[PDB]
Every structure is written in C-alpha cells, then in structure tokens.
C-alpha cells in the first residue's frame, strides 16, 4: 500500500521481530507432517502435469 | 495490466453486503484485485449457514486441474478448502488447530473439575 | 511518430549505473556490532541472528586465516550442527573476495556442498554466504572425522474415485496400486541451491 | 640454514623506480601482478626498502588481486631476512595474519627451526611456533625440533601464563603431538591431552576453540586415560587438575548429556589406577635431543632439489610475465 516514496507513518519502526517460543516434540511432529504433505502435494502436481501432457499429446 | 510476473493463483473474492460475509473462489492472478479481472470462475463458497445448514461448495476439476498444471499456484485458503473437501490431503494447519482445540477442551474439563 | 526516447534514455542510464557502480557488499551488507544494523538502509535484523554475530564470524574472514584462502579446506555451519548431527560442511573451490574492505569479508565462496555426508559433483554457486554461522575443522582429524553416519498408496478419496472409474469402465481390478514419489524429494528447510533466486544488490 | 642458500643469480637493482611504478599500477584501480614485487624483494638489500615493499603489498592485498600469493617468493623473502637483515618484517606480517596470511609451511620451516636452535633465538622462534600451531604442518621432520622448543619453553617458564596463553601452549603441545618413537612420545601426547582437557573443563567450552584451530570436543581427560591405558597394555599436571576439580544459557551440547564436571571420584580413581599402572611399567628435553641425534641426518639433497625446483618455477613465472607483456 506504500509506494516507497511516501510520508511513511513512523509507527512500526519501534518493534522487534521476536519469534514466539516453540515446543520440541510438537515442532518435530509438525515438521515431519509438513515434509510429508509437501511430498504428497508435489506428487499430485506431477501426476496432474503428466495428465496434462497426455492430453496435449492426444 | 503487466504485473511483476503475475502468475495464476486461485484466490478468494468477496461478494456480499455489510453484515453479510460472502465469498467466491476464483482463478485470478497473484497481484490482480480481489473482485478484478479473472480467467475462469469456480464453484462459489457459501460461508453462512441456513435451514439445517447449506454449506455448499463445488469445483470444476476438468479445468481446475488443467489450469493448475499450466503453472498456477494455490493460496492458503485454497489449500484449506481442498483439505476440507478431500481433493488434497488434510492440511496440517487444520490438524494443529484440532489438537489445540482438544487441549483447550481438556483444560476446560480440568477447570470444571476444579470448580468443585 | 513520437517515440518515448527520454524514458529509454533514463532506463539505460539507471541500468548502467546500478550495474557498474554497484555498491560493494562492504557498504550495504556490513553489520554494526553495536546494534546489528546494515548501512545503506538503516534497518534491524531478525532475533535469531544475534549470537551468531557475537560468538561467531562470517565465512571469508575465516578463510583469511587459511593459506591462500583455503584452496582445499573445509568449513561447517553452526545451524546444521544444531539441527543435525551428520557431517554437513562446505569446501572451497573458487573464492570471490571483495577488495574494497579492510579484513576482507562479506565476499562469495563456494564448493562441493554435501548434505548429511552426501557429496556432489561440480561445485555449485554460493548459498547463504553473508551469514555468521561458520565453524572451521582444521586438517588434524579432518578426513578421519568426515565419515557418513519410492512410492506410497493413494489416499482414500482418490482411491475410491479410481475404483469407481474402473467399475464404470467395466473391469473390476480390486488391486490398490501406489503413486510415484521418485523425483519428488522432501526438501528440508535448508535445501541447498543457489543465490540466483535470492539475488543480492 | 642460510649457508646452503647463497645461490640466487639476481639481476639489476632497480628499487625506487620499480616501486613507484608498482604503486602507480596499484593506483590504476585494476588488478596487478606481484612478480615485480617478488623480483624486488629478491634484489633488495636494505631494511627501509623491505618495509616499504611490505606496506605496498599490504595495500595491494586490498586490490582486485586479493590472490596472487606465491609461496616461493615469501620463502626467498624469509631467506633474505635471515641473511641480510629485515628483522621486524616477516614477524609483523605473520602477527597480522589476516593482513597477509602467507603461511609458507614446508621444509623451509624445518631449516628455520634448525637455524633458530643453532643461534638460540627467542621472539622470532616463538612467533614461528605460534604460526605453525595456527597453521597446519607436521609433514616435515621438523616435528622433533618443534617439540624440543615447546618442551624447552614449557619447562624453563613453568607458570600459569594466562587464558589465551595457556590455550596456545596446550595447542602447540597437542597439535604436533603425533610422535610414534617410544614411551616418550606417548607421554608427551598424554601431557598435551591432559592440558587441553584441563583448559576445556576447568575454564569453559565456549572460550577454547573460538579462534585457535581446534575441535569442539571437550571430553579429553577420558581420551588421555584411554591412551595411557593403551600404552600401558602395549604426571603432576593431571594431579593438579584433579586437585582443582575437587576444589570448591548458551549450551552447545544435548540437554540429556550430563556435563563432565560431575566426575570427581571417577576421574580420581581412573587417574590413580592408570598412573600406578604407568609407574609399574613406564627431562623430556634430553630425550628429544637424543631423538634428534638419531634422526635429522642432514638430508639436504631433497631440500636442494626443492630449492632448484622453486628457482625454476620463479624463472618460468618471469618468462610468463615477459610473454604476457609481449602479448598485451
């Protein structure tokens, strides 16, 4: 929304990008879940791409 | 309009009045406006329920899958809807929310037991 | 016809300037050890990059302590040692030091990058070289230390859909095959690649 | 020593003009070669001129040619320093380290240690020891002389020194600790390992391998115990270490992993048993001198071959520079 060259309301420069705390077991479980879900999504995308290629060939 | 690599991104789009939230999944660009130009329109979304609930949602896979394979990306609410429908696997964020809700229910049960 | 020549002239001038007189990393990628700020912008840095600049140093300023910028030396990463216990380290094959700076730093250096002891062929471009998580492993106990420690069934919805399609076609086929995840890799958070997508100023 | 080196076949002695030309080439804001500076250093015969050349090389380090650092050039420079003068030059460049990082490790270091032991040097030899422990060497038979000097300076100045000084001493005692002669080498290795383990445990884990080239392994007392048990199957330092141990957040390890601080009785018993075993089976400067008497047969043929090869390489570099000037 800010086009670089703007008066930029100096109201957000007084904050620290602090990352909230995290648990160990829950974080590892979620990491494995994300990895497997991304693997499945990439597999589905590859299947859709193969189907599109077959359609284009036909 | 020439966008900075405006790739196709199936995003949501409002379509209701004040005090009347209504949405509609649409296959638009990643930078185009919400209710702006779009290519194809998919099955609208019904958020508010009614008589015995009518949360209706539809999708035209024949063209949705084609546009996806054509190099289009998906947004977070798009993945949420896909997981709720069953096309894609259940979103992990939904599972985390369910686990947090279960933990909150356990805490509420503990508080209720402490009431006595 | 009246073509837009002034716009093209301005574009060419700006491109030539930004490509020739580009500010070296020593000017824009510098880090203030008193407040962790980067000149040429005046902004702070994430919180997870505090101790890295305090109790650790960058990459090229460590290479400087090696003979000839370490023509064949190694170097590990603190983040990998914290996340994984496998021998994950870097090496040097072609260094690109910046000459416009005392005690050279912020430069670019790469080599044969390995992941969990999985070396590769032909050194790849840099990957997060302006960081501070760098730990050295001298020659003593070097080679002796560097030692190494398909498919899936379809989901229920797609499985049922395929079975229904088969039934509609005619053939029954009660077999539940498995999809392919060959080229699909479970790229971790630190998937090594290149700085092309994450281009610098 | 430098006696077996007087054989350079130098050329003209144009110093000031060529130095000004090199300064101008550096001012050109373009990469420049250091072959002219190498030729000068080989032909220079003064002290202020060598200082000016060193300053010019330092300023050139911040030039487009951050590389282009031939080792034979620094070898000839060190030989000139040994022969003529130029005392506080190589020492300063190596103390800076980051400003130069020459690290000319080779049999040249062996001859340097030999010459220093012949004249009984002090500050220059100590700087060379700091350099060799900061760099990576021990591929030459100079390890005997290095251990001799280390034991000399460790037994003649038995003091607590300081944090960084103790770390440097422990490193210089352990880094070359790869002897394989007899019980003396194993005893020296055990002494170095015990010193490193003490410096790692008594002090801390973060202020040890920070700057010096060492691994983050803290458990060194167990390693020394195992090494001495092995040498027995085939000193007062550990006594004082155990006594201090019995005397009365950033975590770079696993939470379940218990720190080695809570190991007073185990360490005491193990050290006592293994020391009794050693005494049953089983100062060092004389032993290292006797070792040197056996080895170090003045094997100067290989060094003469290496010097001839380096001279041929310098001549080839001069010819390449001539061909380059002809092409351009």
XYZ file of C-alpha atoms in Angstrom:
703
model
C 0.000 0.000 0.000
C 3.050 2.229 0.497
C 4.635 3.308 -2.800
C 8.158 3.607 -1.375
C 8.182 7.389 -1.916
C 5.615 8.278 0.736
C 5.489 10.031 4.126
C 5.691 6.550 5.752
C 3.904 6.867 9.101
C 6.776 6.193 11.511
C 4.696 3.959 13.798
C 6.050 0.446 13.089
C 9.809 1.116 13.343
C 9.589 0.633 17.133
C 9.158 -3.150 17.276
C 11.384 -6.233 17.439
C 10.673 -9.158 15.112
C 10.580 -11.605 18.035
C 9.739 -15.255 17.250
C 7.379 -16.740 19.871
C 8.531 -19.801 21.805
C 8.148 -23.309 20.388
C 7.944 -26.855 21.745
C 10.288 -29.703 20.750
C 8.123 -32.780 20.183
C 5.248 -30.797 18.673
C 7.640 -28.881 16.414
C 9.310 -32.060 15.144
C 5.946 -33.747 14.551
C 4.749 -30.692 12.628
C 7.980 -30.594 10.609
C 7.551 -34.234 9.593
C 3.892 -33.553 8.779
C 4.829 -30.588 6.580
C 7.535 -32.598 4.811
C 5.191 -35.492 4.033
C 2.357 -33.162 2.991
C 4.653 -31.255 0.628
C 5.866 -34.568 -0.800
C 2.266 -35.643 -1.427
C 1.390 -32.264 -2.959
C 4.399 -32.430 -5.286
C 3.423 -35.970 -6.287
C -0.127 -34.831 -7.060
C 1.247 -31.900 -9.067
C 3.492 -34.257 -11.045
C 0.504 -36.519 -11.718
C -1.547 -33.547 -12.931
C 1.338 -32.425 -15.152
C 1.598 -35.927 -16.627
C -2.153 -35.938 -17.281
C -1.930 -32.530 -18.975
C 0.964 -33.779 -21.111
C -1.028 -36.871 -22.103
C -3.982 -34.657 -23.037
C -1.764 -32.350 -25.109
C -0.281 -35.381 -26.873
C -3.719 -36.842 -27.609
C -2.039 -4.833 -16.987
C 1.550 -6.106 -16.979
C 2.178 -7.411 -13.461
C 5.531 -8.349 -11.919
C 5.313 -11.959 -13.042
C 1.595 -12.185 -12.314
C 1.213 -15.961 -12.247
C -2.180 -17.628 -11.954
C -3.191 -18.051 -8.305
C -6.623 -19.399 -7.357
C -7.687 -16.890 -4.695
C -10.904 -15.921 -2.939
C -13.135 -12.948 -3.723
C -15.824 -11.224 -1.675
C -19.379 -10.878 -2.936
C -21.622 -9.970 -0.012
C -23.036 -6.944 1.767
C -22.277 -5.404 5.145
C -23.128 -7.842 7.945
C -23.324 -10.460 5.164
C -19.973 -12.193 4.573
C -19.982 -13.934 1.192
C -17.040 -15.265 -0.817
C -16.323 -16.955 -4.140
C -13.206 -18.876 -5.181
C -11.920 -17.525 -8.499
C -8.910 -18.424 -10.658
C -7.272 -14.991 -10.774
C -3.695 -13.721 -10.809
C -1.429 -13.313 -7.782
C -1.485 -9.492 -7.953
C -4.839 -8.698 -9.590
C -7.591 -7.179 -7.420
C -9.908 -9.360 -5.368
C -13.021 -8.591 -7.442
C -10.955 -7.684 -10.515
C -10.203 -9.423 -13.782
C -10.128 -13.219 -13.773
C -9.878 -16.123 -16.206
C -12.398 -18.758 -15.100
C -14.901 -18.805 -12.238
C -15.168 -21.842 -9.965
C -17.892 -23.013 -7.601
C -18.919 -20.212 -5.259
C -18.445 -20.549 -1.500
C -21.349 -20.433 0.974
C -19.983 -19.400 4.404
C -23.142 -18.515 6.313
C -25.477 -21.470 7.008
C -29.283 -21.590 6.963
C -32.098 -24.117 7.442
C -30.330 -27.266 8.684
C -27.166 -25.767 7.190
C -26.345 -25.498 3.487
C -22.564 -25.057 3.332
C -22.419 -25.768 -0.406
C -19.148 -25.863 -2.348
C -18.379 -27.063 -5.871
C -15.370 -27.329 -8.166
C -14.825 -27.900 -11.893
C -11.845 -30.249 -11.744
C -11.794 -30.721 -15.529
C -10.467 -27.163 -15.915
C -9.118 -26.524 -12.401
C -6.553 -29.317 -12.722
C -5.637 -28.105 -16.214
C -5.019 -24.540 -15.031
C -3.064 -25.883 -12.046
C -0.809 -27.967 -14.286
C -0.449 -24.934 -16.564
C 1.756 -23.276 -13.926
C -0.757 -21.825 -11.454
C -0.193 -21.680 -7.700
C -2.587 -22.054 -4.766
C -3.239 -19.852 -1.747
C -3.610 -20.853 1.903
C -7.447 -20.699 1.949
C -7.420 -22.671 -1.307
C -5.438 -25.436 0.404
C -7.790 -25.236 3.394
C -10.821 -25.699 1.135
C -9.123 -28.544 -0.743
C -8.420 -30.306 2.549
C -11.964 -29.733 3.799
C -13.333 -31.187 0.550
C -10.886 -34.104 0.350
C -9.212 -33.441 -3.012
C -5.816 -32.807 -1.410
C -4.637 -34.360 1.868
C -5.783 -32.809 5.126
C -3.956 -29.545 5.722
C -1.514 -29.802 8.662
C -2.673 -26.420 9.974
C -6.160 -27.885 10.401
C -4.702 -30.770 12.416
C -2.748 -28.352 14.616
C -5.920 -26.325 15.185
C -7.806 -29.507 16.095
C -5.074 -30.522 18.550
C -5.134 -27.052 20.116
C -8.925 -27.266 20.420
C -8.617 -30.675 22.091
C -6.053 -29.284 24.540
C -8.332 -26.321 25.274
C -11.234 -28.708 25.904
C -9.036 -30.718 28.274
C -8.110 -27.510 30.108
C -11.798 -26.579 30.320
C -12.600 -30.013 31.765
C -9.809 -29.534 34.306
C -11.238 -26.136 35.262
C -14.735 -27.612 35.601
C -13.351 -30.332 37.873
C -11.549 -27.655 39.903
C -14.820 -25.730 40.302
C -15.954 -28.289 42.889
C 5.775 9.166 -34.922
C 6.769 10.447 -31.465
C 8.621 7.642 -29.639
C 9.378 7.759 -25.921
C 13.125 8.373 -26.093
C 13.606 10.127 -22.740
C 12.179 7.141 -20.857
C 14.508 4.738 -22.674
C 17.479 7.036 -22.038
C 16.685 7.229 -18.320
C 16.222 3.453 -18.135
C 19.561 2.839 -19.858
C 21.368 5.346 -17.629
C 19.912 3.856 -14.444
C 20.711 0.304 -15.559
C 24.296 1.178 -16.494
C 24.784 2.966 -13.167
C 23.295 0.225 -10.983
C 25.284 -2.401 -12.914
C 28.686 -0.650 -12.969
C 28.871 1.482 -9.799
C 27.004 -1.117 -7.739
C 27.761 -0.686 -4.011
C 30.064 -3.440 -2.799
C 28.919 -5.780 -0.040
C 31.271 -3.972 2.354
C 28.996 -0.903 2.123
C 25.459 -2.352 2.086
C 25.963 -5.842 3.564
C 28.005 -4.538 6.505
C 26.797 -5.282 10.037
C 27.126 -2.991 13.058
C 28.345 -4.949 16.086
C 26.764 -2.363 18.425
C 23.142 -2.606 17.240
C 23.100 -5.205 14.413
C 22.163 -2.794 11.626
C 23.003 -2.726 7.923
C 24.227 0.566 6.390
C 22.624 1.893 3.199
C 19.187 1.052 4.666
C 19.164 1.585 8.426
C 17.088 -1.436 9.466
C 17.482 -4.097 12.142
C 17.921 -7.869 11.760
C 15.971 -10.922 12.953
C 16.325 -12.028 16.557
C 17.707 -15.474 15.646
C 20.831 -13.804 14.181
C 22.111 -12.183 17.395
C 24.550 -14.633 18.995
C 25.749 -15.626 15.516
C 27.392 -12.217 15.057
C 28.630 -12.126 18.676
C 30.244 -15.518 19.367
C 30.906 -16.343 15.696
C 32.262 -14.812 12.496
C 31.466 -14.889 8.783
C 33.000 -17.101 6.081
C 35.592 -15.082 4.150
C 37.070 -13.528 7.297
C 37.646 -17.110 8.467
C 39.136 -18.155 5.121
C 41.558 -15.254 5.507
C 43.138 -17.188 8.379
C 43.807 -20.080 5.961
C 46.639 -20.437 3.414
C 45.644 -18.885 0.080
C 42.005 -18.506 1.159
C 41.991 -22.265 1.731
C 42.412 -23.783 -1.723
C 41.020 -27.083 -0.430
C 39.920 -26.547 3.165
C 36.573 -27.287 4.809
C 34.097 -25.310 6.905
C 30.939 -26.338 8.763
C 27.790 -24.479 9.824
C 26.505 -23.983 13.362
C 22.853 -24.209 12.297
C 23.448 -27.659 10.800
C 25.339 -28.872 13.877
C 22.401 -27.677 15.991
C 19.741 -29.261 13.758
C 21.592 -32.369 12.525
C 24.478 -34.455 13.851
C 25.687 -35.720 10.461
C 28.861 -34.330 8.848
C 27.401 -31.346 6.978
C 30.108 -28.940 5.830
C 31.316 -26.770 2.954
C 34.546 -26.554 0.979
C 36.406 -24.042 -1.180
C 36.926 -24.295 -4.939
C 36.587 -20.730 -6.250
C 36.694 -17.711 -3.923
C 35.426 -14.253 -4.927
C 36.899 -11.851 -2.358
C 35.904 -8.198 -2.154
C 38.904 -5.862 -2.318
C 37.134 -2.673 -1.142
C 37.340 -3.506 2.559
C 39.863 -3.963 5.354
C 39.967 -7.507 6.735
C 38.139 -8.895 3.707
C 34.648 -10.180 4.484
C 31.124 -10.484 3.049
C 32.567 -11.950 -0.169
C 31.431 -15.061 -2.040
C 32.941 -18.542 -1.778
C 31.504 -21.937 -2.698
C 32.485 -25.527 -3.369
C 31.284 -29.116 -3.363
C 28.386 -28.907 -0.903
C 27.371 -32.087 0.929
C 24.203 -32.853 2.894
C 24.361 -35.435 5.695
C 27.531 -36.783 4.106
C 26.123 -36.829 0.554
C 28.766 -35.127 -1.576
C 28.097 -33.901 -5.114
C 29.978 -33.330 -8.370
C 30.986 -29.919 -9.725
C 30.845 -27.095 -7.184
C 27.579 -25.148 -7.125
C 27.036 -21.435 -6.602
C 27.043 -19.859 -3.138
C 24.155 -20.375 -0.707
C 23.787 -18.039 2.293
C 27.371 -16.781 2.288
C 26.673 -13.483 4.105
C 25.787 -15.337 7.327
C 27.786 -15.760 10.542
C 27.178 -19.457 11.352
C 30.560 -20.854 10.316
C 32.796 -23.287 12.209
C 36.177 -24.480 10.945
C 37.564 -28.017 11.028
C 41.371 -27.940 10.615
C 43.378 -30.633 8.838
C 44.123 -32.593 12.019
C 41.457 -35.300 12.341
C 39.808 -33.996 9.152
C 39.405 -36.986 6.829
C 39.050 -39.281 9.850
C 36.167 -37.155 11.164
C 34.258 -36.766 7.866
C 32.528 -40.151 7.990
C 28.959 -40.889 6.930
C 26.866 -41.941 9.924
C 9.899 -44.507 -3.747
C 6.102 -44.764 -3.706
C 3.069 -44.556 -1.427
C -0.536 -45.836 -1.650
C -3.212 -43.474 -2.900
C -5.432 -41.608 -0.418
C -8.958 -42.867 0.312
C -10.764 -40.264 -1.808
C -8.652 -40.650 -4.952
C -8.529 -44.423 -4.437
C -12.328 -44.639 -4.309
C -12.616 -42.328 -7.320
C -10.247 -44.509 -9.354
C -12.119 -47.649 -8.286
C -15.422 -46.068 -9.337
C -13.930 -45.072 -12.696
C -12.677 -48.635 -13.198
C -16.090 -50.069 -12.305
C -17.760 -47.688 -14.761
C -15.274 -48.733 -17.450
C -16.083 -52.409 -16.871
C -13.018 -54.060 -15.370
C -13.120 -54.627 -11.610
C -9.464 -54.801 -10.531
C -9.507 -54.824 -6.721
C -5.779 -54.016 -6.597
C -4.814 -50.769 -4.846
C -1.606 -49.587 -6.576
C 0.716 -46.858 -5.277
C 1.607 -43.480 -6.754
C 5.155 -42.324 -7.518
C 7.350 -40.011 -5.444
C 10.600 -40.618 -7.333
C 11.814 -37.158 -8.355
C 9.689 -35.632 -5.579
C 12.099 -35.014 -2.693
C 11.286 -33.965 0.879
C 13.392 -30.814 0.619
C 14.195 -29.730 4.209
C 14.268 -26.103 5.341
C 17.957 -25.723 4.387
C 17.718 -27.126 0.848
C 20.998 -26.003 -0.780
C 20.591 -24.377 -4.188
C 21.869 -21.005 -5.439
C 21.644 -17.274 -4.773
C 20.103 -16.572 -8.195
C 16.535 -16.589 -6.869
C 17.763 -14.708 -3.780
C 19.765 -12.184 -5.755
C 21.752 -9.502 -3.957
C 22.097 -5.771 -4.543
C 70.449 -22.680 7.475
C 71.077 -19.746 5.136
C 74.602 -21.039 4.435
C 73.147 -23.569 1.963
C 71.209 -20.866 0.084
C 73.662 -18.305 -1.367
C 72.678 -19.086 -4.965
C 70.019 -16.774 -6.419
C 71.574 -15.361 -9.617
C 69.916 -11.982 -9.057
C 69.627 -9.203 -11.650
C 69.621 -5.397 -11.744
C 68.945 -3.497 -8.521
C 66.246 -1.039 -9.634
C 64.247 -0.492 -6.438
C 62.779 3.013 -6.081
C 61.674 3.420 -9.704
C 60.076 -0.028 -9.876
C 58.384 0.510 -6.503
C 56.904 3.790 -7.746
C 55.765 2.048 -10.935
C 54.098 -0.691 -8.878
C 52.383 1.934 -6.720
C 51.105 3.604 -9.894
C 49.853 0.273 -11.257
C 48.000 -0.295 -7.982
C 46.560 3.221 -8.266
C 45.291 2.342 -11.762
C 42.291 0.721 -9.993
C 42.839 -2.577 -11.811
C 44.323 -5.964 -10.891
C 48.121 -6.143 -10.899
C 50.655 -8.953 -10.558
C 53.178 -9.234 -7.723
C 56.002 -10.731 -9.810
C 57.730 -7.339 -9.919
C 57.499 -7.046 -6.129
C 58.919 -10.567 -5.831
C 61.824 -9.646 -8.110
C 62.442 -6.541 -5.994
C 62.369 -8.449 -2.697
C 64.839 -10.891 -4.257
C 67.058 -7.987 -5.370
C 66.504 -5.575 -2.459
C 69.352 -5.357 0.062
C 68.221 -2.917 2.759
C 65.604 -2.580 5.513
C 63.549 0.549 4.837
C 63.079 -0.667 1.260
C 61.756 -4.005 2.527
C 59.426 -2.154 4.905
C 58.101 -0.043 2.027
C 57.635 -3.196 -0.060
C 55.720 -4.816 2.806
C 53.475 -1.758 3.132
C 52.879 -1.788 -0.630
C 51.994 -5.491 -0.513
C 49.584 -4.827 2.360
C 47.900 -2.038 0.394
C 47.784 -4.377 -2.617
C 46.025 -7.035 -0.531
C 43.017 -4.688 -0.712
C 43.339 -4.537 -4.517
C 41.442 -6.520 -7.178
C 44.159 -9.192 -6.888
C 43.337 -10.443 -3.415
C 45.012 -13.686 -4.552
C 48.351 -13.997 -6.404
C 50.469 -15.031 -3.415
C 53.310 -17.359 -4.400
C 54.985 -19.292 -1.592
C 58.487 -19.408 -3.099
C 58.511 -15.597 -3.129
C 57.886 -15.471 0.625
C 60.487 -18.223 1.045
C 63.127 -16.128 -0.724
C 61.997 -13.126 1.334
C 62.481 -15.052 4.585
C 65.894 -16.202 3.361
C 66.865 -12.585 2.682
C 65.626 -11.656 6.161
C 67.771 -14.405 7.693
C 70.860 -13.448 5.680
C 70.931 -9.645 5.448
C 68.586 -8.000 7.971
C 64.873 -7.109 7.709
C 64.233 -8.444 11.209
C 60.849 -6.970 12.196
C 59.152 -7.690 8.873
C 58.056 -11.300 8.399
C 57.319 -11.419 12.132
C 54.930 -8.470 11.835
C 53.292 -9.816 8.669
C 52.656 -13.155 10.385
C 51.421 -11.489 13.582
C 48.860 -9.643 11.462
C 47.971 -12.936 9.748
C 44.692 -11.625 8.324
C 46.533 -8.804 6.537
C 48.810 -11.324 4.782
C 48.257 -14.974 5.680
C 51.402 -16.056 3.837
C 51.664 -19.352 5.768
C 54.789 -20.640 3.940
C 54.688 -24.087 5.543
C 57.329 -26.504 4.239
C 60.845 -27.832 4.864
C 61.703 -24.121 4.956
C 60.161 -24.171 8.437
C 62.446 -27.090 9.318
C 65.511 -25.096 8.273
C 64.154 -22.053 10.127
C 63.824 -24.046 13.350
C 67.298 -25.511 12.813
C 68.852 -22.063 12.363
C 66.974 -20.697 15.383
C 68.181 -23.568 17.574
C 71.713 -23.012 16.259
C 71.711 -19.354 17.356
C 69.223 -19.897 20.227
C 66.595 -17.401 19.124
C 63.634 -16.285 21.236
C 60.961 -13.899 19.948
C 61.184 -14.889 16.274
C 61.137 -18.593 17.153
C 58.152 -18.065 19.460
C 56.308 -16.267 16.658
C 57.175 -19.130 14.298
C 55.783 -21.592 16.850
C 52.582 -19.551 17.144
C 52.335 -19.608 13.346
C 52.954 -23.350 12.997
C 50.337 -24.090 15.665
C 47.921 -21.671 13.974
C 48.596 -23.210 10.544
C 48.736 -26.902 9.543
C 52.108 -28.622 9.185
C 53.998 -31.570 10.755
C 54.525 -33.132 7.308
C 58.286 -32.458 7.576
C 60.717 -33.979 10.123
C 60.813 -30.597 11.884
C 58.354 -32.014 14.437
C 61.310 -33.122 16.570
C 62.760 -29.603 16.736
C 59.287 -28.141 17.302
C 58.678 -30.463 20.258
C 62.170 -29.663 21.549
C 61.430 -25.928 21.540
C 57.976 -26.471 23.061
C 59.387 -28.548 25.921
C 62.192 -26.019 26.415
C 59.763 -23.116 26.789
C 57.323 -25.188 28.877
C 59.892 -26.433 31.411
C 62.014 -23.258 31.572
C 58.992 -20.990 32.221
C 56.629 -23.117 34.323
C 53.898 -20.594 35.126
C 50.142 -20.177 34.808
C 50.702 -17.741 31.915
C 47.116 -16.756 31.055
C 43.863 -17.857 29.398
C 44.865 -17.290 25.770
C 48.487 -18.116 26.600
C 47.504 -21.402 28.259
C 45.310 -22.254 25.265
C 48.160 -21.538 22.843
C 50.583 -23.612 24.925
C 48.196 -26.560 25.112
C 47.603 -26.363 21.365
C 51.305 -26.168 20.485
C 51.832 -29.148 22.804
C 48.996 -31.241 21.319
C 48.891 -30.149 17.658
C 52.358 -31.633 16.915
C 51.664 -34.433 19.406
C 51.810 -37.243 16.842
C 55.053 -38.898 17.950
C 55.481 -42.629 17.349
C 59.013 -43.293 18.634
C 58.646 -44.782 22.126
C 57.132 -44.143 25.562
C 58.455 -40.560 25.467
C 56.207 -39.562 22.575
C 53.184 -41.193 24.194
C 53.944 -39.423 27.480
C 54.170 -36.080 25.669
C 50.877 -36.788 23.890
C 49.247 -37.643 27.224
C 50.599 -34.449 28.797
C 49.200 -32.378 25.936
C 45.833 -34.136 26.065
C 45.599 -33.588 29.826
C 46.484 -29.907 29.422
C 43.801 -29.493 26.752
C 41.218 -31.319 28.858
C 42.009 -29.107 31.842
C 41.802 -25.917 29.771
C 38.479 -27.137 28.361
C 36.789 -28.297 31.581
C 38.152 -26.037 34.333
C 37.566 -22.905 32.239
C 34.777 -23.484 29.729
C 33.732 -24.785 26.336
C 32.992 -21.505 24.526
C 36.371 -19.823 25.160
C 38.713 -22.502 23.819
C 38.242 -23.415 20.148
C 36.905 -19.939 19.307
C 39.959 -18.557 17.477
C 42.623 -21.270 17.618
C 42.287 -24.195 15.176
C 40.829 -26.852 17.479
C 37.811 -29.143 17.529
C 34.881 -28.557 19.888
C 35.500 -31.920 21.600
C 35.713 -31.304 25.380
C 35.978 -34.870 26.655
C 39.775 -35.059 26.540
C 40.508 -36.450 30.014
C 38.804 -39.710 29.036
C 40.829 -39.704 25.813
C 44.074 -39.303 27.766
C 43.024 -42.078 30.154
C 42.316 -44.398 27.220
C 45.606 -43.500 25.519
C 47.629 -44.204 28.663
C 45.743 -47.455 29.269
C 46.625 -48.456 25.702
C 50.300 -47.514 26.027
C 50.414 -49.497 29.280
C 48.759 -52.541 27.696
C 51.392 -52.494 24.932
C 52.257 -36.636 35.772
C 51.841 -33.773 38.239
C 49.721 -31.919 35.663
C 46.810 -34.349 35.992
C 47.328 -34.398 39.772
C 46.898 -30.622 39.958
C 43.954 -30.844 37.565
C 42.162 -33.348 39.786
C 43.005 -31.272 42.870
C 41.453 -28.194 41.252
C 38.422 -30.237 40.178
C 37.951 -31.310 43.803
C 38.374 -27.682 44.891
C 35.318 -25.612 45.790
C 22.212 -20.086 28.900
C 24.438 -20.980 25.945
C 24.540 -24.794 25.895
C 26.455 -26.301 22.961
C 25.527 -29.880 23.937
C 22.489 -32.103 24.387
C 20.229 -31.454 27.365
C 20.225 -35.137 28.337
C 24.024 -35.243 28.028
C 25.444 -34.671 31.508
C 28.400 -32.312 31.769
C 31.791 -33.781 32.656
C 32.039 -31.511 35.718
C 30.315 -34.126 37.911
C 33.099 -36.685 37.589
C 35.352 -36.071 40.601
C 35.520 -39.592 42.120
C 35.500 -41.361 38.747
C 38.312 -39.184 37.385
C 40.263 -39.525 40.636
C 40.053 -43.327 40.711
C 40.760 -43.770 36.996
C 43.748 -41.415 37.042
C 45.153 -43.061 40.175
C 44.839 -46.559 38.704
C 46.341 -45.629 35.336
C 49.178 -43.645 36.937
C 50.000 -46.628 39.150
C 49.991 -48.826 36.041
C 52.312 -46.398 34.242
C 54.708 -46.205 37.196
C 54.747 -50.009 37.315
C 55.531 -50.086 33.582
C 56.540 -46.649 32.307
C 63.945 -34.356 31.433
C 61.954 -34.717 28.214
C 64.215 -32.135 26.557
C 67.168 -34.525 26.808
C 65.028 -37.306 25.327
C 64.016 -35.129 22.372
C 67.667 -34.136 21.906
C 68.656 -37.811 21.821
C 65.874 -38.413 19.291
C 67.222 -35.587 17.124
C 70.660 -37.198 17.407
C 69.238 -40.356 15.814
C 67.193 -38.782 13.009
C 67.983 -35.486 11.245
C 70.809 -36.915 9.131
C 71.270 -33.602 7.262
C 69.051 -34.926 4.466
C 69.725 -31.791 2.404
C 69.516 -33.441 -1.031
C 65.716 -33.250 -1.084
C 65.842 -29.632 0.093
C 68.369 -28.748 -2.617
C 66.078 -30.369 -5.187
C 63.147 -28.349 -3.826
C 65.185 -25.134 -3.980
C 66.159 -25.856 -7.587
C 62.510 -26.553 -8.425
C 61.425 -23.277 -6.812
C 64.111 -21.358 -8.712
C 62.948 -22.970 -11.958
C 59.360 -22.027 -11.091
C 60.422 -18.420 -10.483
C 62.248 -18.354 -13.827
C 59.146 -19.787 -15.509
C 57.000 -17.104 -13.869
C 59.389 -14.424 -15.144
C 59.179 -15.913 -18.643
C 55.377 -15.993 -18.401
C 55.302 -12.336 -17.344
C 57.564 -11.477 -20.285
C 55.301 -13.350 -22.708
C 52.297 -11.568 -21.185
C 53.877 -8.131 -21.602
C 54.684 -9.111 -25.192
C 51.096 -10.196 -25.883
C 49.485 -7.116 -24.317
